[PDB]
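TEACHING EXERCISE
Course module: macromolecular assemblies
Task: Read the component lines below, then compare them to the predicted structure of the full complex.
Student: A.B.
Group: 4
Components provided:
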Amino acid sequence: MLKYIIPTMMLMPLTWLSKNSMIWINTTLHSLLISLTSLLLLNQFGDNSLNFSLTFFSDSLSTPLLILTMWLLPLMLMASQHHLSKENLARKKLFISMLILLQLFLIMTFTATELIFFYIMFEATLVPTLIIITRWGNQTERLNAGLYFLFYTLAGSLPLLVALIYIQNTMGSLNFLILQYWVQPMPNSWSNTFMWLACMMAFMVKMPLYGLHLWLPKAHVEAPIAGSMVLAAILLKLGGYGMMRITLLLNPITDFMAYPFIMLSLWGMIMTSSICLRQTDLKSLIAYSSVSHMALVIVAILIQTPWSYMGATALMIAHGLTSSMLFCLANSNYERVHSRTMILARGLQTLLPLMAAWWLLASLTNLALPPSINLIGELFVVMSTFSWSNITIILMGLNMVITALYSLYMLITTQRGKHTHHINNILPSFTRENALMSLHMLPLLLLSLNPKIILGPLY
Amino acid sequence: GWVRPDLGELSKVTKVKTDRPLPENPYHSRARPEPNPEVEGDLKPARHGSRLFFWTM
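Instructor-supplied answer key:
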C-alpha cells in the first residue's frame, strides 16, 4: 500500500514545480495513472484479507472505496476550474495541493489497520475540507457552514477517542485481527452502554442521522464543487466504512440498545425525503437525498445480516457516484446561470440538447433503475429489514415512492417545458462537462454489468 | 611537686585502657528493614521498539 502512499506524496511537488499553464495537464495525467495503478490492487481472495503491512491492510470492504477515492480525485481535479481559472497561480496551486493532501489522508484512513490510526486520519480528513469550503465557498454563510461542520463533527467524534483508548488498554492492541480473534461479549451493564453510545454516536454524527443532519446541507449549498463532491461521497461513505469496522465488537448489547437509532433513522428518512420535495435551492435537494440514503445505510448497518452488509456497501458506492455526479450537473447549471434557485432556470430541453441525456440518466440512477447498483443496494436492504420485522417494509416502499417522486420532479422542473426567454447568456455545452459526465456514468454501468467487485466482505 | 600544665597541654586527644567492652547498637533501635534489589547486567534492544499504539521500531 506504500506503493500507493508515496506517489500521492510525489504528485504534490509536481504541482509546485510545474510551470504556468502546465500544472493542469501534469496533475490530471498523473492522477489518472494513479487510478490505473489503484485498479491493479484488486487481488483479494477468499479466506483472509490482504496485509500491506502490520501498518496497512485491505478488507474487501476497503478495496472499492479506495478505488473510488483514487478515481474521484482526477475527476474532481478537472471539475474545479472555470470558477478559479481567473484566480492567482499561487492560490490555484494551493487549492490543488490541498486536494492532493486530502486524497493522501483518505488513503491513510481507508487502509487503517489500527482504530487509533483510523481516528487520527479520520479527523485528518476533517481538517482541509474546512479550509477549502471557507476559502472558496462563493456565498455569504460559508463561515456558518464550515463552523457547524467543524464543531458537529468534532463534538460528536471526540469521546470515540476515549472509548478507543479504553479498549486499547483493556484488551491489548487494536489490529483488526487481534481486536478480532479475541473479542469477548460485553454484557448489559451501563458503562458498556455508554461506550457503545460514544462510538456509535460519533459515527451517527458523521453519517448523519435525522437529529444531527443540518450539519450537512449548509456544507453543500455553501461550498465549492470539489469540497461538495469529496465531502458527500468520500466522507459519508468513510463514516459508514468506520462503523462497519468498529461494530465487530459489542455483539450482545446492540440488540438491547439499538432500537431508537433504527427508529430515528427510519422516520427521519421519510421526513427527509418529504422535505426535499418542495424546496428551492437545487443544490440542497441532492444533499437531503444523501441524508435519506445514508439513513437507509444506517438502518442497514445496525441490523446485522450478511445480506444487509452486502446491500449496505453496494448502496454506499452507487450513491456516492450518483450524488457526486448530480452535484456536478447542479454546478454546471449554476455556471450557466448565476442563480442557485430552481424555478428560474427553466427550459433547457430545446437549448443544450445533449445535457438532457445526462440529467435523465443521473436521475434514473437516483431513481433505483433496476439493473443499476443503487437498486441492488436498496433491494438487499429491503430484504434484510423485512427479515428484521414484517411491518417495516411500508416505510421502505414509501421512501421508494417519494424518492422517485422528488427525483423525477427535480428532472422535470429545471429541464422541462419553457425557457423563460430573458436569460440569453447560456452557451452550448463544453467538452469538459460532458467528459466529466462520461467519467461518472460509465464506471457505474460497467459495475452494473459485473457487481461481484463492490459486494463487500460477506460475498 | 605538681608541675603546671603548659599552654595548651590540656588538649591533645588521649588514649585510655578500659575494662567494659565497646558497645554495638548504642542507639537502641531495630534492624534495617530491607535492602533494595539492585538491577544489574547488560541490556538488550527493546522488544518491538516502543509498544505504543503504532510506530513499530
